[PDB]
Amino acid sequence: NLKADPEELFTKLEKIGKGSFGEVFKGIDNRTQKVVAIKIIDLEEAEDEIEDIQQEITVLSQCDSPYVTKYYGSYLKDTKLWIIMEYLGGGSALDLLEPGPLDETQIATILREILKGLDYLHSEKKIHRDIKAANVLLSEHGEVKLADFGVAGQLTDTQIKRNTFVGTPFWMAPEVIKQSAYDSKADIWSLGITAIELARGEPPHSELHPMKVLFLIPKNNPPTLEGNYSKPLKEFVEACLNKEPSFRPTAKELLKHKFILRNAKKTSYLTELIDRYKRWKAEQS
Numbered sequence: 001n002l003k004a005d006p007e008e009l010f011t012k013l014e015k016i017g018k019g020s021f022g023e024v025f026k027g028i029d030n031r032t033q034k035v036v037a038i039k040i041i042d043l044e045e046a047e048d049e050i051e052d053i054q055q056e057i058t059v060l061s062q063c064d065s066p067y068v069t070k071y072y073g074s075y076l077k078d079t080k081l082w083i084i085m086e087y088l089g090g091g092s093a094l095d096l097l098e099p100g101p102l103d104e105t106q107i108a109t110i111l112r113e114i115l116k117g118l119d120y121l122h123s124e125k126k127i128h129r130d131i132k133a134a135n136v137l138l139s140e141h142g143e144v145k146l147a148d149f150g151v152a153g154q155l156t157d158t159q160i161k162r163n164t165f166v167g168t169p170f171w172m173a174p175e176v177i178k179q180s181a182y183d184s185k186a187d188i189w190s191l192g193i194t195a196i197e198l199a200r201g202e203p204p205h206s207e208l209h210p211m212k213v214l215f216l217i218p219k220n221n222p223p224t225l226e227g228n229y230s231k232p233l234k235e236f237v238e239a240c241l242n243k244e245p246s247f248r249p250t251a252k253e254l255l256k257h258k259f260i261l262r263n264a265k266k267t268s269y270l271t272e273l274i275d276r277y278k279r280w281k282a283e284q285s
């Protein structure tokens with residue numbers, strides 16, 4: 001269902017970031033005057049990644065959730081592909097970490113929304129496979145959505161597990177690194193690492209070369225959250241970071257976790273985090 005002549009319907013504005021496969025631009029929907037995001041891919045240089053580009057479009061087109069970046073369509077224009085998506089003016093959760101530590105209400109609120117996205121994807125038999133703070137995007141008013149579906153996996157009636165080596169090493173589950181038959185529980189491990197990332201600012205082993213962590217993650221005991229954090233947050237992380245995937249809770253189960261129930265609050269409060277970043281960035285030299 002590829003479409004054509006995107007500039008009849010959309011206006012391309014300035015670059016707002018680097019994405020997977022290409023650059024992302026702000027844009028305007030000329031029908032509504034709402035702002036959109038436009039990922040532009042040069043298909044002439046897209047030798048090999050073409051399969052992942054195709055997967056991103058396919059997965060996006062099949063999702064309809066408030067917790068997954070909305071998809072407006074894909075348009076061909078010369079050698080370039082325009083992937084038109086929901087605009088999220090708060091940028092990534094990773095960027096919002098830069099000014100300093102989050103508090104546990106912020107951590108819980110963000111994790112809750114990520115969990116609602118994972119619950120949706122997993123119920124659709126989709127596995128994100130690159131869960132990390134960089135792929136968690138916020139609206140300017142604090143709504144949270146999962147993004148970047150280029151390496152997402154799809155389970156079917158004839159394929160009940162995946163085994164592809166994909167993801168970002170520090171966040172990868174041990175069974176993904178070993179390329180065992182795995183499923184949505186791999187996302188739950190990555191969620192645990194992301195919880196540490198949100199709490200401490202960086203995932204475990206962040207100082208090391210990624211090739212080193214590829215042997216450390218299966219070799220070592222799972223990471224734990226160290227430092228002055230509430231018992232339920234430490235236990236949330238521990239529950240996610242089990243070497244045995246079948247012992248990890250589902251996203252649905254984690255939405256009932258004491259840490260989430262006690263600490264998550266209205267998403268609109270996350271606007272404070274966006275304002276904190278704007279202030280920080282404006283002062284930055």
Ligand SMILES: CCS(=O)(=O)Nc1ccc2c(c1)[C@H](/C(=N/c1ccc(CN3CCCCC3)cc1)c1ccccc1)C(=O)N2
Pocket residue numbers: 016017018019020024036037039069085086087088089090091092134135137147148274277278281
């Ligand atoms: C996983 C990131 S991706 O592969 O570029 N895909 C993607 C999909 C949908 C999107 C986006 C990316 C954006 C997207 N939006 C965005 C990025 C950066 C800003 C600017 N910041 C915003 C926060 C206050 C200070 C300035 C505003 C919006 C984006 C682009 C590139 C990297 C991370 C986030 C968006 O609004 N919608």
